Design a protein around this ligand. Sequence first.
Ligand SMILES: O=C1c2ccc(O)c(O)c2C(=O)N1Cc1cccc(Cl)c1F
Ligand SMILES: O=C1c2ccc(O)c(O)c2C(=O)N1Cc1cccc(Cl)c1F
Ligand SMILES: [Mg+2]
Ligand SMILES: [Mg+2]
Ligand SMILES: [Mg+2]
Ligand SMILES: [Mg+2]
Ligand SMILES: [Zn+2]
Ligand SMILES: [Zn+2]
Lengths: 368, 368, 184, 184
Amino acid sequence: LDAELDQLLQGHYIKGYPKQYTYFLEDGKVKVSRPEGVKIIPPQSDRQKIVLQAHNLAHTGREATLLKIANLYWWPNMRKDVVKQLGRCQQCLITNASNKASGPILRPDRPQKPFDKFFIDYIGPLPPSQGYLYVLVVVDGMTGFTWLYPTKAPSTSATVKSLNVLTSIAIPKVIHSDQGAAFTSSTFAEWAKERGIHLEFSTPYHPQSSGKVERKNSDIKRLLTKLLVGRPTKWYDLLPVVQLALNNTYSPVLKYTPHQLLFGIDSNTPFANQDTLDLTREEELSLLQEIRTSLYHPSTPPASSRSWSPVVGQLVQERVARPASLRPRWHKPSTVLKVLNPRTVVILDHLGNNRTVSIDNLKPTSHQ
Amino acid sequence: LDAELDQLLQGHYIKGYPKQYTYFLEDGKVKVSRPEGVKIIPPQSDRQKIVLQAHNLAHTGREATLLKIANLYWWPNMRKDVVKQLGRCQQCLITNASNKASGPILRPDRPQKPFDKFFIDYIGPLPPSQGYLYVLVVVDGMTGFTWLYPTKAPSTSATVKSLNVLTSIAIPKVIHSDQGAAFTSSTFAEWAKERGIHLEFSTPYHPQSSGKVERKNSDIKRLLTKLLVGRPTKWYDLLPVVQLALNNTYSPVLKYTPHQLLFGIDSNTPFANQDTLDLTREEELSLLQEIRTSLYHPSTPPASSRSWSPVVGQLVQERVARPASLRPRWHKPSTVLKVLNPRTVVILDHLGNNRTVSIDNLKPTSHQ
Amino acid sequence: DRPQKPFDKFFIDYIGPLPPSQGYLYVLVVVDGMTGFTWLYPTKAPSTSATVKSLNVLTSIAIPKVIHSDQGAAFTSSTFAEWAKERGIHLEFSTPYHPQSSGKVERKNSDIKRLLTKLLVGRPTKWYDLLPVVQLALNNTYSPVLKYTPHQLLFGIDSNTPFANQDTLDLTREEELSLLQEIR
Amino acid sequence: DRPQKPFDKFFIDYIGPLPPSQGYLYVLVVVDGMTGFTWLYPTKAPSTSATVKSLNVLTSIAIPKVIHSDQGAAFTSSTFAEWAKERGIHLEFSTPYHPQSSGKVERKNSDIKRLLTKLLVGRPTKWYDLLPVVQLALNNTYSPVLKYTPHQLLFGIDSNTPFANQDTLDLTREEELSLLQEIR
DNA sequence: ATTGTCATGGAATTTCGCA
DNA sequence: TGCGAAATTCCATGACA
DNA sequence: ATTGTCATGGAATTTCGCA
DNA sequence: TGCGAAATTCCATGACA
Ligand SMILES: O=C1c2ccc(O)c(O)c2C(=O)N1Cc1cccc(Cl)c1F
Ligand SMILES: O=C1c2ccc(O)c(O)c2C(=O)N1Cc1cccc(Cl)c1F
Ligand SMILES: [Mg+2]
Ligand SMILES: [Mg+2]
Ligand SMILES: [Mg+2]
Ligand SMILES: [Mg+2]
Ligand SMILES: [Zn+2]
Ligand SMILES: [Zn+2]
């Protein structure tokens, strides 16, 4: 503070104050003639207060804060002090946006077999058709084969009714869902334990994680819309049609329809493929086993030039889910406990709980 | 049709049916042994019906439709017929998504002078503060200098009250706004003609066009949020503070605050810049004229690898504004009358009106 | 002549009336000829209407080239014919009083009747809820003649619910005793 | 000593009471010393409270180093002093009965009084709505002594509303006749 | 008849202090 | 005429009912 | 304790028919 | 062993409360 600046005025050299400048006194204050002009050099014991008043004018970041300070002051390594303050401003840390993108998305392996993994989800509310407002959508991971059920609500109870009917055909090893009320209930947990079905949940507020079924939702709405053009939106009666229509549609990249991936032979639908007319069912089935293993699988895309990837022990902040008007979009900083994979982490959260969270719902806390 | 295929069966060459294949008859139908298998060659008079039944199963695009047809049929240039049908399917054309991006954005020149152009807009509804729910935001194009007014509604009448107060300072040549109810009313038109102010409107549903003010809205909400952290959202009393705080904040790229761009000298606010303390006001003003003309101006970014740009007379479709559940997201095809600039067009619309529309609210009609 | 495939032929039939369960009285039985895969639908009557409603569910999953049946009223109605023609399904009838399927199918239909009976005793009223578990059972049952279950032939994979206990299917002395008493 | 700048000194004063217009009785007058730029605020009273409310609007646009005033009650109150101290504004008073500004300011204040009078005749009740147009007039008026209008000195540009008719500012024989009659 | 914008904080690049 | 560190500039990211 | 996906239609690239 | 055209494959774009 005053020891340093005293020591300076008498022309002896202090580390950080370049020797080639003349450091006078005037109006009771230490000054210096820098090429930009004459600036006051405050004592070190004053600096934090100054940086703070400058930052507080509009809660500005590094440069915009520095430019205020530089108007009146100079001292060695100003930005280090500015940055020290930014890293401690609660208000800035939880309100500002990130400017680092997520690391590139994972492309999980396709389930190996039909019934290994189901992805389920609700669409709706839709315009009321026959008293029905929602659709339960069930998508077999491996095949894409899809089942549709009209419900009155997206409830556990309507889920259970529908899946009792579906599972008459087969029991899946795993059912993946998002964290909707209907799937996370204890009743639904029981329903699945009762059948040796494992329940797997998306990280919260991250529908991409149910990508398989969400994407099928798009096709379902898109075909429903086309069929309803210029008619009243009476969709209930079309579910069966849409289900069958989609289950028998080719994926151009795969060259197979979901029905074919499931059964290895077309049923009596229009334009049935007849290429295995001469094989025995058994010959057919082992051609299907071959087709199933050799399907195109996409790869992890290039990282963007400014992504971040979570490191164990890093300070990171979870996005507020449904942030009120004029309230911060981020939670207080929290720590990465475990890196589950490069897009998924466990954090020690804003209360004191463990949360498994998508990297897309996180930012790295700025300034460390 | 039958002339062609008859002519063919007897082994004479028809253009389009390669000679090296054997074209027999069987079960009353013309067939051919192609490497993929034996396929029926329908008569030409049957083809449109076939392509149509195949397309109609799930309103599939080119490949997915072709793959159905190829299961049973072969003929010369199948995809040309498939594409002919896709270009005539109303339902597909108005429901499908585009897969061509817009051309790169324009960066309009900065207004030359303060008061040349105002950008105005509403923020809200906000949580009620003193009976107020909205904020009128007025941003001087050239300087960024911003005025804030709390209103009870985003009405013409509250706009006029506020602008009567603002224009006590100066009258702007132009006021740019979006097409909100408050700005498009005949009352507001009169209010502006009365003062020789020209009204300029954004293309509809395209807030980027009010980018100048929208961007300032972000800063306004962001500073309001920080100031309100852990307090009840009593924002009315902060407008003045926020206004002044922002008008005196540096833009790191410019190295000037909006107040400086407007007045060429800081007022008695904290950390006032003092570099022109020794110039006469007149010397100061011509330094300001110099500073104003030399400000950083950004440029049109690279086009994405798959953008389109409108050509006069092209078929294009305007995005439906607020599309009902299960209804098409696109309007019927319409024609580009005039290319106003490469991001703006006049089209002969879905009724019979002329509409000036942003390229971002258009897709090029597929298959021509 | 070409080998037999799944969806080549569905064999359908009604079983009932049964004691009412959740309002239902009958079971429409559909068995795929090639695989022996069974689907079961509860109905309120052996009518064309109930058949159509039920087959509309199934035929939105897969459509048979041929439906085979006895000359039941529901199946010989002209509505049922119109329905089938609409879906390009050929209808096929066994001559009256002489019901013929195929050994595989007959044996399957037998298993169904027996397994039903075994569970509608003790709880003659709770069968509606059990139809799912019955089908899984029937479809994960090993076939003597083929090396495979219907599940396996239909989907070309093992099942997550194998029924490793090829089961009794016969009535214990207790069940013969309270079934020969309840049906009196 | 350093040249004079805008915001160096604001000169403030009350004009009134006037006939009520939209509920208002007075005008707070603020004139920038360097430029002669004028801001006008209608108030209901010459109180510290009305002054503060009005200056809070102005000082959210720009803050003067110094406010100069006569020893009016509103300005010499300790609330008004607390207000100014809070904003780092030095307060400055002319000695009682001896009001001094600067020639530029005095002339400006004169123009304001005269131009007001000229418009509050015929419509002594509609002045509230006219305050905007008065300011534009005053601020786009050519200054004999400087080559420039206040607009130009404040913003360093020409204005989109120049008042090319350096105007009468004097009362026509009709207005002297119905002002020497209405004020009786 | 019109048209994106700019605070942000790591990283990349330049300039500074000294020799 | 060159080094290590500070300062400045660059610029992708994201949010403006 | 978990993780994006895939129809689409121009363009780029390969294959086909013929010589 | 090479050409012009058709066929196939590539892949950016955008939408799944
Ligand atoms: O925002 C939700 C959402 C929220 C909660 C749910 O339970 C749920 O099912 C959904 C849901 O489908 N989306 C749509 C969506 C938006 C953006 C990207 C993707 Cl992949 C996407 F599916
Ligand atoms: O969606 C609107 C909108 C709609 C209608 C209005 O009248 C209006 O003012 C706005 C508005 O501010 N946004 C927010 C917004 C969304 C996406 C991009 C940009 Cl630049 C952006 F400003
Ligand atoms: Mg959901
Ligand atoms: Mg969803
Ligand atoms: Mg708006
Ligand atoms: Mg807006
Ligand atoms: Zn802050
Ligand atoms: Zn279509």
